Write a protein that binds this ligand. Structure first.
Ligand SMILES: C[C@@H]1C[C@@H](O)OC(C)(C)O1
Ligand SMILES: C[C@@H]1C[C@@H](O)OC(C)(C)O1
Ligand SMILES: [Zn+2]
Ligand SMILES: [Zn+2]
Ligand SMILES: [Zn+2]
Ligand SMILES: [Zn+2]
Lengths: 340, 327
């Protein structure tokens, strides 16, 4: 019954305010409006043509995803990935797509973050969840963290501060991994040393690897497996070294078949899927957004328009695909009880 | 004729006594807006900076050059607010310091030139406030990216006439490599201040650069960890040379004939988030005068050493105006 109930119930924070869990609907759990650096969009909007050009590009892209069935995206851009929550709020309103904003730290923290203690980082993450981001009043609904191989000492602090903020607020944790180095195992160990429940943790970029034994072992422990970069592929772009380095040479079909493999091995309930797409991208080489758009014009609509029909023909029932894209994110994003 | 400040353009005669290397807040891009509670609050930081700039003003300072770049967390709206409430001109900076994020580190020399030009010719962010100086940095041998920033700074200076000021590891003679790269771009040494030059005691390094026409930034005079020897982080940042030792380098360059090329400052701040947490309180505990340290302590020290008032006015008024005046 309660799955049909919109006008009451528990709540997820978005850039437009709280929404009920049922309103979230089809949710992409790892996306970006703009992948940048802190303060960069405000200091140099001409890098993106203009701020207005970026807004208009993002609103059209979100409308394309919405027409394909998407109702919510989780923007896992942190402070140091140049998250501008005022941009998210504007494009969410214009496109009528819910956007959940993130706290945490990604792979480019400035000195003012790198020098902080685990206690200080915990207060910063709590601030963005409990008080709001900057002076906007918009509260983060997820905590994003990152490793790229064996964790640095600072990255361990970030992982611990994220676990502590999650336990205190109930909001979930989502991670960036170097999947081929099995980063999720060390992340899991640190999270579990802090008492964090695996069901509150998504081990991301897990479709970057073909090692099913690594993925199923994490899923068997209750971790969520983020198969979040399905359209990332430089096939056909072999003469472009920067695009090949970033997007890899594994096909989207290979990445998507990992979704079916986890389903076949009984781990449907542990799967989250996404595109890891963006509408602006300044933290890499200059032409990269144009290159990515030439590869995947569907943008964030790639999961519903391409991946779902591909898995359907492979025999995955629609109800299973709806469970992965609607129910699984709703359980992930719904805050748990605060500790104490 | 005019110098751009955070309150708009001013004429050369309005600059007056000018501190040429200062910071309202040493931070990181976006950090003040995202975590103002690190500084107590934004309002507390404003109040502290206004009290400090008002004390400097009462001591005779009329202008400071805030050499905080994008990646040092420059918030030009903060600079404008504090400048207005203390009635002290503030010149803002473009360029890049020692902590550029990926979106900067990945850019070409042409792209960086366009960014520096934007902040000088158009304005910083959406504020309409234009930079009046370009800040660059090395810490020993330049990284490949730092070479790009030095060349972009030279190109922006040549296009606009605004000067370049540098951060050095002075004991590694970084000014020599900076000079080499600048001159390979056709930049005049008279448009360049080699900063943190009081961090070294090698007079021959400084005089050779000044004999080539460079300006010499003796800009961290009150930086000293004397009395803080049990504090490893303060000692590493501030050094164990006394302020008197740093100030005597001013007199030495005067005595060697370079008074027209000396620029003096405090390199002080009112907030400081890019280092260890307690550092601003520690620094304030050894120099309560803050930015007033140059007029209240260094000036009398040099006057007792026999430096005439006309020479000290030349260094603190004439030189900064000549340096900041475009082209
Ligand atoms: C800012 C984001 C982070 C991660 O999702 O990688 C990509 C390349 C998509 O950039
Ligand atoms: C932000 C400023 C930059 C440079 O002047 O170093 C100090 C330590 C004084 O911090
Ligand atoms: Zn990532
Ligand atoms: Zn991402
Ligand atoms: Zn410096
Ligand atoms: Zn400085």
């Amino acid at each position: 019954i309660s799955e049909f109930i919109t006008n009451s119930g528990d709540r997820i924070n978005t850039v437009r305010g709280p929404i009920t869990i049922s309103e979230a609907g089809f949710t992409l759990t790892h996306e970006h409006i703009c992948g940048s650096s802190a303060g960069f969009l405000r200091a140099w909007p001409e890098f993106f043509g203009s701020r207005a050009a970026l807004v208009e590009k993002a609103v059209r892209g979100l409308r394309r995803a919405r027409a394909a069935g998407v109702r919510t995206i989780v923007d896992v851009s942190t402070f140091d990935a140049g998250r501008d929550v005022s941009l998210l709020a504007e494009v969410s309103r214009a496109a009528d797509v819910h956007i959940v904003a993130a706290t945490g730290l990604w792979e480019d923290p400035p000195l003012s973050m790198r020098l902080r203690s685990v206690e200080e980082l915990t207060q910063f993450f709590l601030r963005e969840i409990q008080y709001g981001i900057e002076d906007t009043g918009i509260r983060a609904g997820i905590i994003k963290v990152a490793t790229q191989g064996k964790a640095t000492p600072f990255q361990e602090l970030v992982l611990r501060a994220a676990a502590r903020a999650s336990l205190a607020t109930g909001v979930p944790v989502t991670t960036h991994t170097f999947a081929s180095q099995r980063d999720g195992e060390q992340q899991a160990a640190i999270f579990e040393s802090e008492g964090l429940s695996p069901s509150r943790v998504c081990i991301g970029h897990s479709d970057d690897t073909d090692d099913l034994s690594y993925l199923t072992a994490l899923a068997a422990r209750g971790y969520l497996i983020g198969l979040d970069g399905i359209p990332h592929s430089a096939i056909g772009l072999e003469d472009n070294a920067s695009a090949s380095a970033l997007l890899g040479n594994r096909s989207w079909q290979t990445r998507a078949l990992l979704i079916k493999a986890l389903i076949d091995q009984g781990y449907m309930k542990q799967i989250l899927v996404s595109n890891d797409w963006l509408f602006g991208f300044s933290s890499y080489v200059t032409n990269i957004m144009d290159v990515m758009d030439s590869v995947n014009p569907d943008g964030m609509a790639f999961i519903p328009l391409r991946v779902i029909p591909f898995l359907r023909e492979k025999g995955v029932p629609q109800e299973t695909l709806a469970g992965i894209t609607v129910t699984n994110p709703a359980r992930f994003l719904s805050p748990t009880l605060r500790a104490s």
